[PDB]
């Protein structure tokens, strides 16, 4: 809708960057709004929900188990890991690693999860067998969220990463389990609550992945939908600035009322 489009805008002044925004049909995927769609931003955490898709596109194939229980050790521990840190001795299944990653964004858990599908060049590889030709990880957590203006490493589109987690969540990419497993982890996402979901009302479902850079950038993908199904997919990235944390997560909120508000 235009007055979305006006606060996207509104946004980039706010911020003093620049902002990519697309709205897709779950069903259709026709597009309903956009604003930068081809351009391209660092994915940072918003991976993650790709990552367990590759994991679990494995787990279909008889390639991979979610009750495989992984060891590892403190070497492996990465910044901001909330929930590996906390299993050196015992480990962690795949399937307790997919819910950190998406639920908790821990990091360790990604990287653990990268090495079991044989790193971000597999990811990419996993992203382009599906038809994905644009999205791209190169590194692992936690370089890959240097955000490094102009650099095409571990970058992804609007459009992109709209098109590819529509098909993550709604094609016969995924089998209906794994389809539903990966929305289910995403419903549960803990770490978003002052973007999208702060300005979602109450029978509302929203299902996310959130990310963000040292150098201010900030990013959600999101299936939403009124009467507690998700019937939108909604893609937003920022290019980084010196504005507050509370004042970026403020901006995209205030996109999501817009986005609700003529739904």
């Known amino acids: 809708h235009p007055e979305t489009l006006v606060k996207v805008k509104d946004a980039e002044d706010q911020l003093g960057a620049r902002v990519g925004y697309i709205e897709l049909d ?5 597009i309903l709004e956009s604003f930068r769609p081809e351009e391209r931003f660092p994915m940072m955490s918003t991976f993650k929900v790709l990552l367990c898709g590759a994991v679990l596109s494995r787990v279909d194939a008889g390639q991979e188990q979610l009750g495989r229980r992984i060891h590892y050790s403190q070497n492996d521990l990465v910044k901001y ?3 590996t840190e906390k299993h050196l001795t015992d480990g962690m299944t795949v399937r307790e690693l997919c819910s950190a990653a998406i639920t908790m964004s821990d990091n360790t858990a990604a990287n653990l ?6 790193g971000p060049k597999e990811l990419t590889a996993f992203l382009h067998n599906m038809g994905d030709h644009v ?4 590194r692992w957590e936690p ?5 490094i203006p102009n650099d095409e490493r571990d970058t992804t589109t609007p459009a992109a990463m709209a098109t590819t987690l529509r098909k993550l969540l709604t094609g016969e990419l995924l089998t209906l389990a794994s389809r539903q497993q990966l929305i289910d982890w995403m419903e549960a996402d803990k770490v978003a609550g002052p973007l999208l979901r702060s300005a979602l009302p109450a029978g509302w479902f929203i299902a996310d992945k959130s990310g963000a850079s040292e150098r201010g950038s900030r990013g959600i993908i ?3 939908g009124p009467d507690g199904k998700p019937s939108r997919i909604v893609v937003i990235y920022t290019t980084g600035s010196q504005a507050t944390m509370d004042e970026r997560n403020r901006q995209i909120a205030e996109i999501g009322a817009s986005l609700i508000k003529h739904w």
């Open 26 to 30: 779950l069903n259709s995927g026709k």
């Open 143 to 147: 370089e890959l969220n240097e955000a």
């Open 113 to 118: 999860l990268l090495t079991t599908i044989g």
């Open 135 to 138: 999205t791209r990880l190169d």
């Open 81 to 83: 890991s909330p929930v």
């Open 222 to 224: 999101a299936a939403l």
